[PDB]
Amino acid sequence: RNFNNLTKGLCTINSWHIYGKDNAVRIGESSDVLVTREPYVSCDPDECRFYALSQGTTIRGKHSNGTIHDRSQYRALISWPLSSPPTVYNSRVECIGWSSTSCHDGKSRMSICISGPNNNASAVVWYNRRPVAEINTWARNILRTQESECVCHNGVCPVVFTDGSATGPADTRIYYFKEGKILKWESLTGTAKHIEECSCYGERTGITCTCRDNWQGSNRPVIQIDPVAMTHTSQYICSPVLTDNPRPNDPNIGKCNDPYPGNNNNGVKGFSYLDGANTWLGRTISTASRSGYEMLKVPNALTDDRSKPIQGQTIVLNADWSGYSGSFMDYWAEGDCYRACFYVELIRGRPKEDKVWWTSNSIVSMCSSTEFLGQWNWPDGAKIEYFL
Amino acid sequence: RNFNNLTKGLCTINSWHIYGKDNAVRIGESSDVLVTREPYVSCDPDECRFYALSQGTTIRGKHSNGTIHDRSQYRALISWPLSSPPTVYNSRVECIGWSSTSCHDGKSRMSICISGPNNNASAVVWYNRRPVAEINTWARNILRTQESECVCHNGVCPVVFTDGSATGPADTRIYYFKEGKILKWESLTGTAKHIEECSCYGERTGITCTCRDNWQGSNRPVIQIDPVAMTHTSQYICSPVLTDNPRPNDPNIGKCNDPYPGNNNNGVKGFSYLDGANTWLGRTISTASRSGYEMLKVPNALTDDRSKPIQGQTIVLNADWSGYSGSFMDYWAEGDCYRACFYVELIRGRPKEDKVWWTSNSIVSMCSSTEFLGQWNWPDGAKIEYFL
Amino acid sequence: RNFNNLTKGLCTINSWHIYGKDNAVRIGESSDVLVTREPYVSCDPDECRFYALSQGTTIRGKHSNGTIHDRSQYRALISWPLSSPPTVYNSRVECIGWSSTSCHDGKSRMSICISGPNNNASAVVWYNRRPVAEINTWARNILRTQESECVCHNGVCPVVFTDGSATGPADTRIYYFKEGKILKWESLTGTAKHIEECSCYGERTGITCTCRDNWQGSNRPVIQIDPVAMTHTSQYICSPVLTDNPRPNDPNIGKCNDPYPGNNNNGVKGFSYLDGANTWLGRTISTASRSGYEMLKVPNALTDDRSKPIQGQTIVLNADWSGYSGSFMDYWAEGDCYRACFYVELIRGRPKEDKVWWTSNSIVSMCSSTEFLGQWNWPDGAKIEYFL
Amino acid sequence: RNFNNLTKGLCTINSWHIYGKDNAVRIGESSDVLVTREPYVSCDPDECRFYALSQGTTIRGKHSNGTIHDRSQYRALISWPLSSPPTVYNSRVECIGWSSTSCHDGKSRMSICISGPNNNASAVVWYNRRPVAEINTWARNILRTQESECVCHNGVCPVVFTDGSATGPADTRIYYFKEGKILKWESLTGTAKHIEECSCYGERTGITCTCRDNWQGSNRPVIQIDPVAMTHTSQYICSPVLTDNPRPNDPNIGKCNDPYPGNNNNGVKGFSYLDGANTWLGRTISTASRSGYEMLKVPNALTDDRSKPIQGQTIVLNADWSGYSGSFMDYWAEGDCYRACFYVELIRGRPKEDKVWWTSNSIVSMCSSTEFLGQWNWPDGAKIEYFL
Ligand SMILES: *[C@@H]1O[C@H](CO)[C@@H](O[C@@H]2O[C@H](CO)[C@@H](O[C@@H]3O[C@H](CO[C@H]4O[C@H](CO[C@H]5O[C@H](CO)[C@@H](O)[C@H](O)[C@@H]5O)[C@@H](O)[C@H](O[C@H]5O[C@H](CO)[C@@H](O)[C@H](O)[C@@H]5O)[C@@H]4O)[C@@H](O)[C@H](O[C@H]4O[C@H](CO)[C@@H](O)[C@H](O)[C@@H]4O[C@H]4O[C@H](CO)[C@@H](O)[C@H](O)[C@@H]4O[C@H]4O[C@H](CO)[C@@H](O)[C@H](O)[C@@H]4O)[C@@H]3O)[C@H](O)[C@H]2NC(C)=O)[C@H](O)[C@H]1NC(C)=O
């Protein structure tokens, strides 16, 4: 087998079709489904799998009480087959920790997990299911990474890390790995003022990451990585179509090199595909809470600060809870181009639903089509009443 | 490996022997068995598996309440090993939707699922476990397909779709796929007046489909497809041995090019093997409800409008519930000929058994023998009392 | 790969060591373990597995009520990994029926299941997980076979069938299969007066079967099969060490060509290894019920009607329930000789324990050693109280 | 494939990172997790797995009542995937018994289980999942072995056995196996006065074992094995840093060739890595009970009777229960050196927590890093209240 090379461009995106859905909370009502959060999707050359951070307990288990908690010693990055629920019996543990990333380079899979206390966290880099390299905290304030898949080109896999305050200036680094070993790291450069939880995809030798400004911005920071030169730039999506949550209402002029103001000290992991006229943005429908999800076709959103939507598709109704969202692609599919995909985390439980004492999620997943397909909406589908 | 070619004919069918039975409802009384309906069977070159449409919940789970419902966002086409029950832990998801078909071409498996609202449904074609082609609704009225396996010849797999009214003229299309890509489609031709849920099998370069007239007929429409020329004809089974449900009593003269009247706006998925003197028809024993199942040897049923049974075998007693039935064959078995097989869906729960609030099924499956074997009857075997 | 040839002899048997134990009833108290009976063990070239007849329900499931019943449509021959319990999720179904046999020929596995009503039963022969041949009842009175593994030599696998009364003269046949196809069958010959449930093993081109006389004898009938000439002889074990159950007390003179009298119309499946001075017999400790199990070294038991034990080993205490027992060997192990093995069925529930309404079993399994090893006793270990 | 050779040395150990954690007791609160004790970790060339002695029951199962019991017929050595819990459905049984060891030689895995009554125990040696050799008790007093992995060099695998009193002089033997067959055994030599439960690792053609003196010593005996000459020596760790439990307080002078006094007739399985200046010792934090665990860097602990710690890392807080600990290494990882690993058994239930009637454990596992990583603490994480 061989190192994957990013030689293709994105397929024309004319709509989105259903790709995967696990119905985890529905099924977990009467089965041994693991409590999770921060899910994502990542492909191997022969298989696509769901990924998430387990809480080391099932939903019906009494230890699910208090799983709104983010970081603990009982968390672990798990993977399981596409569209099946994350269960005790069908889940494979990749590594131990409460923040993670993962990707296949064509030959083997690299997985990274971060664990530890807030002032002494450390990352372990696994490659081919063995631990290979370790990274200590450099700012002693919750070392953390992407919570979705990384991308590899010719065996080189860039990973975005952040260490420091979640609500002020922090220390963001881009690490370049090959076979789990560290080739290089560099401090964040460019005009982006704060970076959390980057969603990445690869196209024609370039890697694009769409991130979360948890400090002052409701526009999304963007990191463009050159995986061959191992260099990067950063800015914001210039579009006045704001895609963080919570967020102000859409203005008529966006900001390219500074945060759009109005909401401080919060955000949500999100994604975008930035491809000239083929540009699609995702966001929650609500401007106030993590409910609803929609895709919006915004031509040149990355560079045009007046750009507005010309097409869209609803993924989750506003009346239904959403959550994190992120990008992935099957880089080993057939065809001349890469088909854009994404997932949406459907959070159930706390804080929004405090009749139960747990927090979990299920997953819905979509891929692009060149057809103009009809749309549906994909709620989690569980009824809280049944869990009382 | 290679594309399968339909070079063989049917084996002489002298009786039927038991092939598979999963006892899903019995076992699901105390295990994590998924609620399903619309099951079928399909073989790979190395394995035969059960298939069905899951409801995204187990039977004991509270979310099984209301699963008489046909189309929802929690449904998915699943497969699992022959004669095992469909459980949360042993089931593999093929694709997401509430109407489906699937077949192996010798090299890889094609699976098709349809999802969406009634006026905006769309089909996704998977090949080798990756999405490859999409089809939008053309009549905006529940785009739907076979609910049993398709058949492939030299990499070409015909699939019958219907879009439009279930109780009047509708738009039926035959699609021809190769490696998941669309080669051709054509509107329904011939004398068949309404097509639903075709059951297909392949023999000596020809593909035969037996379908359901849900509009006016209680005789079954038949589609004969040429997979090399990618053309087809259609008519009804001429035999006065009527095989839909519900249905009038058997007359002495059948109809070849028009529906046999008496029952409107209903039917059931069924099958037949049409092979001259080796012709066998399946049907429910009751003329009023989905109970009982029998096989009847009706020589030249396809072309002879006076033809009557000369041999038979009871599969399910009239006192026991049945349901959908359909055809499949192991095209990779040894021997000079293909052995005819079929399955019967054994529906339990609503509407017929409303003490419970769920609807599910188990599967019984048979194959042909050249021996004259003794017969048994194969009920689902669950006791509703235990579920109260 | 190649057809296995019986070129080796038995290893010297000086004692027995523990080989496998599944603790099914213990574990099944709080897990989804399938109710079973008639278990056995059979090896592939790369794996050894447990086999049994499932009842299509778990032990905790309410449908376990009445599973003392022998023949039903919910039974199936299942296999699962050595020393694990037979669970819904880890069991593989081989075929459907209520009497069975199975063996690997070196290339692929043949499995045979019999199903149907008492007067119309039929056997289906599976080879390489596909149905290949069918056999109708010839005496219309519960067609039945070995309930333990068959043995193959150069692709030829003899199987002993019985059809007719269980308490009088019946029609016993030896079938010779190759790749699931029937080469030959012949009626029972020799001095054995009644044959049920043969336990077989292979040595130096010869196949030895030890059976159950359910009519008048408490000595065990023996069938010696030549798999190359496809011929056989039969007689009884001449030894006064009687090994059926129930049975008279041991006399000082056994019978070679007629049943030893005193107990009519009952018996239990059992086994022996007949190897001159290396001869070991198994039997229940009790002469009245299926409790206890012991191995006895009885030199020339097959031919010497005065022969008595000179060594022994207790397997199950008399205070503990036993059941069927049978022989198997790993014909693909390393070494110059075949090591003798056996299993004992540990029946729990009805009729002996009627506080519960179910009947099930677990398995204990032993193999021979050339060392003189210490002995233990291996009870099932479940407590009935917990199931109330 | 090939026999592994111990050609490498240990990597410089500057700290420890998290490797694996199964959270078995947490998860087992509402899932079918097997009750276990005496766990360990062992690697194949392509996979690392958890190992433990099952009690033949799940934690929620009523048969978990009384599982503080050490030796019974319902115990078995099981293995399951790294960091998953030991469940009924995902566990593989290696062999039957209540004391065990296991290791891969590069080609295949050898597993050894001991079973039987106290005065008649015997070991069965499995190789490539088949039984190959048997060893009878030589002192008729609980034949017992390592309870963690053995190490192989060029196909030769040394295993340390003990037979006789646990609280006085006993008969310890070192067995040398190849492909499961016995090459040689020799009685214990050197100055070590009592040997139990050796933890072993391999480095540059030498095998080091750290054991438990259950008689008079609170310093740990050490066995150094030459696997090529098949010879050994023994002594104690000279360091005044005492690593058994319970134990006196640390003095300023240790003992090299005799037990350090103060605590009799007890101990705990433990480990050490003895590598000159790269020497790390493990021990419980408490001197009185099995709570807490810490690693201490003690230069030349093996030979220097004045040596004291110069660096350390806390693994489990003193407020949390610990248990057995032992060594393992991935001998098939990439790099010029072997990375030291270990596990800690986290015992929950009896005797320390007698509100429940069961005894079980979970596992935490660590590996060495050349980075100076921040430390966390890794408790089992279950709440006993939930099990009442
Ligand atoms: C079966 O399925 C199909 C396939 O899915 C369904 O068809 C889909 O239907 C949906 C819903 O209608 C469509 O999504 C919307 O698309 C519009 C954009 O399309 C319109 O506008 C285009 C651009 O117009 C401008 O530019 C052109 C220059 O070329 C100029 O001509 C024009 O005058 C104008 O200047 C048009 O080109 C386009 O026409 C085309 O499409 C028509 C069909 O749609 C067709 O008839 C035409 O012939 C032509 O082919 C069309 O007119 C998006 O604007 C819209 O997104 C807004 O609205 C949703 C609510 O629905 C909202 O959630 C979005 O966030 C967004 O609204 C916010 O953002 C704006 C920008 O910032 C802001 O200005 C708004 O005020 C609003 O802001 C507020 O809400 C947000 C959200 O909380 C908040 O953050 C803010 O702060 C503020 O509070 C939808 O995405 C699909 O495009 C369409 N797909 C296809 C293929 O047709 C079909 O309906 C189904 N059938 C059935 C029976 O159900």
Ligand SMILES: *[C@@H]1O[C@H](CO)[C@@H](O[C@@H]2O[C@H](CO)[C@@H](O[C@@H]3O[C@H](CO[C@H]4O[C@H](CO[C@H]5O[C@H](CO)[C@@H](O)[C@H](O)[C@@H]5O)[C@@H](O)[C@H](O[C@H]5O[C@H](CO)[C@@H](O)[C@H](O)[C@@H]5O)[C@@H]4O)[C@@H](O)[C@H](O[C@H]4O[C@H](CO)[C@@H](O)[C@H](O)[C@@H]4O[C@H]4O[C@H](CO)[C@@H](O)[C@H](O)[C@@H]4O[C@H]4O[C@H](CO)[C@@H](O)[C@H](O)[C@@H]4O)[C@@H]3O)[C@H](O)[C@H]2NC(C)=O)[C@H](O)[C@H]1NC(C)=O
């Ligand atoms: C052990 O197992 C074996 C193997 O399974 C068992 O043997 C099987 O037994 C079953 C049950 O008896 C048989 O099934 C029935 O078969 C008959 C057909 O066989 C008969 O008819 C043949 C044709 O006769 C005509 O043509 C010939 C020309 O050659 C002419 O000679 C003759 O006079 C007549 O003109 C005969 O050839 C055939 O003879 C052969 O077989 C005999 C044994 O069967 C043997 O003795 C002979 O020597 C010779 O070898 C035989 O006489 C089917 O007709 C029948 O199906 C009808 O009946 C069932 C109810 O049992 C019903 O459910 C069916 O739907 C059907 O009845 C409906 O359809 C008709 C056609 O439309 C209609 O006219 C009826 O009025 C009826 O319609 C009503 O009900 C339906 C259903 O709801 C409804 O829709 C309608 O509207 C209306 O309300 C059975 O299939 C097997 O063939 C047989 N197998 C074998 C290999 O023998 C054995 O019994 C078991 N042993 C034990 C101890 O249990």
Ligand SMILES: *[C@@H]1O[C@H](CO)[C@@H](O[C@@H]2O[C@H](CO)[C@@H](O[C@@H]3O[C@H](CO[C@H]4O[C@H](CO[C@H]5O[C@H](CO)[C@@H](O)[C@H](O)[C@@H]5O)[C@@H](O)[C@H](O[C@H]5O[C@H](CO)[C@@H](O)[C@H](O)[C@@H]5O)[C@@H]4O)[C@@H](O)[C@H](O[C@H]4O[C@H](CO)[C@@H](O)[C@H](O)[C@@H]4O[C@H]4O[C@H](CO)[C@@H](O)[C@H](O)[C@@H]4O[C@H]4O[C@H](CO)[C@@H](O)[C@H](O)[C@@H]4O)[C@@H]3O)[C@H](O)[C@H]2NC(C)=O)[C@H](O)[C@H]1NC(C)=O
């Ligand atoms: C640690 O583990 C080891 C290894 O397992 C344990 O050692 C084992 O211990 C067991 C139990 O003691 C032994 O099993 C018994 O073996 C005897 C046979 O061995 C004796 O007899 C031999 C033959 O003697 C005759 O021939 C020779 C000619 O060479 C002649 O010299 C002699 O005088 C006599 O004529 C002797 O060779 C043999 O000696 C050897 O072994 C000795 C140790 O055993 C050793 O000390 C010697 O130096 C020499 O090396 C020995 O004396 C079996 O007969 C016996 O089986 C009977 O008894 C059990 C009950 O225990 C019963 O269940 C059996 O069914 C059987 O009894 C029935 O069958 C008879 C035949 O029909 C009948 O006559 C009886 O009346 C009885 O019938 C009644 O009960 C049955 C059952 O319900 C019923 O069906 C009937 O109708 C009727 O009601 C045992 O199998 C192992 O052999 C032995 N293994 C080894 C390697 O030593 C050790 O004990 C453990 N240690 C500890 C501390 O626990």
Ligand SMILES: *[C@@H]1O[C@H](CO)[C@@H](O[C@@H]2O[C@H](CO)[C@@H](O[C@@H]3O[C@H](CO[C@H]4O[C@H](CO[C@H]5O[C@H](CO)[C@@H](O)[C@H](O)[C@@H]5O)[C@@H](O)[C@H](O[C@H]5O[C@H](CO)[C@@H](O)[C@H](O)[C@@H]5O)[C@@H]4O)[C@@H](O)[C@H](O[C@H]4O[C@H](CO)[C@@H](O)[C@H](O)[C@@H]4O[C@H]4O[C@H](CO)[C@@H](O)[C@H](O)[C@@H]4O[C@H]4O[C@H](CO)[C@@H](O)[C@H](O)[C@@H]4O)[C@@H]3O)[C@H](O)[C@H]2NC(C)=O)[C@H](O)[C@H]1NC(C)=O
């Ligand atoms: C983020 O994570 C990092 C990484 O983990 C954290 O950093 C770690 O912090 C821990 C905790 O502080 C450290 O573990 C302790 O290490 C000390 C040893 O280090 C000290 O001593 C060294 C040796 O000093 C001697 O020799 C040198 C000669 O070179 C000489 O210079 C010196 O004067 C003296 O003679 C020093 O070299 C060393 O300095 C280095 O490290 C410093 C940072 O640690 C740094 O500042 C320096 O510049 C230099 O680089 C340092 O001073 C261990 O001694 C200690 O272990 C004892 O204490 C724990 C309790 O904490 C106890 O459980 C242990 O069992 C042990 O105590 C017992 O054993 C003794 C020996 O027998 C005995 O004498 C004691 O009385 C005691 O005995 C009692 O308790 C036991 C236990 O029950 C019982 O059995 C007895 O009977 C009796 O009752 C710790 O292991 C790590 O080393 C350190 N790692 C690193 C890389 O720095 C960091 O804290 C985290 N950050 C945050 C914010 O949380």
Ligand SMILES: CCC(CC)O[C@@H]1C=C(C(=O)O)C[C@H](N)[C@H]1NC(C)=O
């Ligand atoms: C420490 C700041 C960080 C990103 C803003 O908080 C995240 C936000 C979360 C959220 O907004 O739901 C949940 C994340 N699990 C959490 N990440 C970590 C490592 O705890």
Ligand SMILES: CCC(CC)O[C@@H]1C=C(C(=O)O)C[C@H](N)[C@H]1NC(C)=O
């Ligand atoms: C929309 C008409 C269609 C065929 C008549 O209804 C079917 C009949 C069913 C039935 O008769 O039981 C159940 C099918 N799940 C359903 N198919 C869909 C797509 O909903």
Ligand SMILES: CCC(CC)O[C@@H]1C=C(C(=O)O)C[C@H](N)[C@H]1NC(C)=O
């Ligand atoms: C027989 C002495 C032996 C070592 C001291 O006891 C062990 C100590 C144990 C313990 O200290 O927790 C549990 C072990 N399961 C047990 N080993 C056996 C074979 O029973």
Ligand SMILES: [Ca+2]
């Ligand atoms: Ca923000």
Ligand SMILES: [Ca+2]
């Ligand atoms: Ca109809």
Ligand SMILES: [Ca+2]
């Ligand atoms: Ca008898």
Ligand SMILES: [Ca+2]
């Ligand atoms: Ca001690």
